[PDB]
Amino acid sequence: MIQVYSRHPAENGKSNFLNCYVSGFHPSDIEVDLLKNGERIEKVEHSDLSFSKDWSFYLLYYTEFTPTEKDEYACRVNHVTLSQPKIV
Amino acid sequence: MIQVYSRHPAENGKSNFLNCYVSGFHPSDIEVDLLKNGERIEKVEHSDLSFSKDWSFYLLYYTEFTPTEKDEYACRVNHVTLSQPKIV
Amino acid sequence: MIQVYSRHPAENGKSNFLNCYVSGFHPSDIEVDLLKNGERIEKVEHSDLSFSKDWSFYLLYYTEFTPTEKDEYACRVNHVTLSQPKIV
Amino acid sequence: MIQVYSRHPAENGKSNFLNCYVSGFHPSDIEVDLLKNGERIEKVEHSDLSFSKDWSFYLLYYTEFTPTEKDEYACRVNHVTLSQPKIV
Amino acid sequence: MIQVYSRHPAENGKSNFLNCYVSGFHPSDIEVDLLKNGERIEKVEHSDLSFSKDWSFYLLYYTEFTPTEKDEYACRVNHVTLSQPKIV
Amino acid sequence: MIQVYSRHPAENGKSNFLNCYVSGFHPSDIEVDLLKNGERIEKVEHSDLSFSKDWSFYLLYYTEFTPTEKDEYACRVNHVTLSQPKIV
């Protein structure tokens, strides 16, 4: 029983990894305005400019939270497994 | 029983990985305005400019959350498995 | 029983890893304003400009939090496992 | 209000003349501009003005470079005269 | 208010003349600009003006570099005259 | 209010002339600028003006560098004259 694993790659260049995993709440480039340039305005009342309310990543009420999760977050992954079982 | 695995690639160049995985709430390039340029305006009242309400990635009420999940997030993945079982 | 693992790669270049894992609440490039340039304004009242309310990453009410999770967060990962069991 | 008074009255024999041998990368008199004269501009986003990325005169992969050359660069220039008199 | 008075009246034999051998990377008279003259500009974001990244004259991978050359650079220039008289 | 009075009246034989052998990386007269003249600008963010990154004349990987050369650089220049008289 012979099991041979040979790996010798040549990477002739530079490697660049950016923003491998992005998730969650990330809004961007949002502009909200009221009366940006205002001239001769008699009255402004009851202006409501609220971007967001309460923030909570995990909100649970009377909950049974039992997840079984195996995860692997990365940019470059190498997984190699050699098995040579012998049973008599 | 002979099991041979030979891998020797040549990568003649540079590699660029960007934004491999994007998910979630990410709105962009949104503009909301009221009376951008305002001249001789007698009255502005009851203006409602709210981008969003409460934020919550996980919201569970009386829930049984039992997911069994194996996941692999990456940009470049290499998975190799050699098996040579012998049973008598 | 012979099990040989040979790995000798050549990386002819520089490696750059940036922002491997980003998550959570990260909003950016958001501008909210009211009456940016204001001239001859008689009255401004009841202005509400609140970006966010209470912040809480984990909020649990009457909850049983029992997750079984094995995770591996990284930029570059190398996982190698050689097994050669013998049973008689 | 933007007022620009730019004048380039006189040029005599500006560049690249009376040369025996010219080669390589020599671009000249190239102008790249975005919003050269701008007034009351609200938002400029995501502008890419990269001229070039990589400069490599010799880039060889698994190559056998054996050029044989005999070159004689013998130019002869006689009685060159450049005159730019200015009288005020 | 921006007022600019720029004048470049006289140039005589500016560059790259009477040369026996010119080679390599020699770009000239290249202008790259963004919003050269700007008034009342609110937001400038994410501007990339990178001219170049990497300068490598000899970049070889697994190469056999054996150039044989005999070169004679013998130019002859006689009686060159440059005159730029100015009278005020 | 920005007022700029810049004048460059006279240049005679500026650069790179009467040279026997010129090579390599020699860019000249390159101007890169962002918002050269700016008034009442609110926000400038994330500006990249990197000219270059890495300068390597000889970059070799697993290379056999055996160049054989015989070069004679013998230029002859006679009676060069540069005159820039100024009378006020």
Numbering used by the authors:
A (entry chain C), B (entry chain A), C (entry chain E), D (entry chain B), E (entry chain D), F (entry chain F): 6 to 93
Reproduce the article's own wording on this structure:
β2-microglobulin (β2m) and its truncated variant ΔΝ6 are co-deposited in amyloid fibrils in the joints, causing the disorder dialysis-related amyloidosis (DRA). We show that the aggregation of each variant in vitro results in fibrils that are polymorphic, which contain different numbers of protofilaments and different numbers of β2m subunits per layer of the amyloid fibril structure. High resolution structures, however, show that this polymorphism arises from the assembly of a common building block that is strikingly homogeneous and monomorphic.
The majority of these (69% of all data) describe a side-by-side 2PF arrangement, termed ΔΝ6-2PFa, which we were able to solve to 3.0 Å resolution. The density for ΔΝ6-2PFa was of sufficient quality to allow an unambiguous atomic model to be built for residues 6–93 of the ΔN6 chain (which constitutes residues 7–99 of the wt-β2m sequence). This model shows that the amyloid core of the β2m subunit is a hammer-shaped fold that is delineated by the single intramolecular disulphide bond (Cys25-Cys80) for which we see clearly resolved density in the structure. The same motif is found in both protofilaments of the ΔΝ6-2PFa structure, but the two protofilaments differ in the arrangement of their N- and C-terminal regions, i.e. those residues that lie outside residues 25–80 in the sequence. In protofilament #1, the termini are oriented ‘upwards’, i.e., away from the hammer motif, whilst in protofilament #2, the termini are oriented ‘downwards’, i.e., they fold back and pack alongside the hammer motif of the originating subunit. The ΔN6-2PFa and D76N-2PFa structures have a very similar structure. In each, protofilament #1 adopts a “termini up” conformation, whilst protofilament #2 adopts a “termini down” orientation. Firstly, the”termini-up” conformation of protofilament #1 presents a peptide segment (residues 15–19) that allows the formation of a binding interface with protofilament #2. This involves both polar (residue N17 interacts with Y66 and Y67 in the adjacent protofilament), and charge-based interactions (including a salt-bridge between K19 and D59).
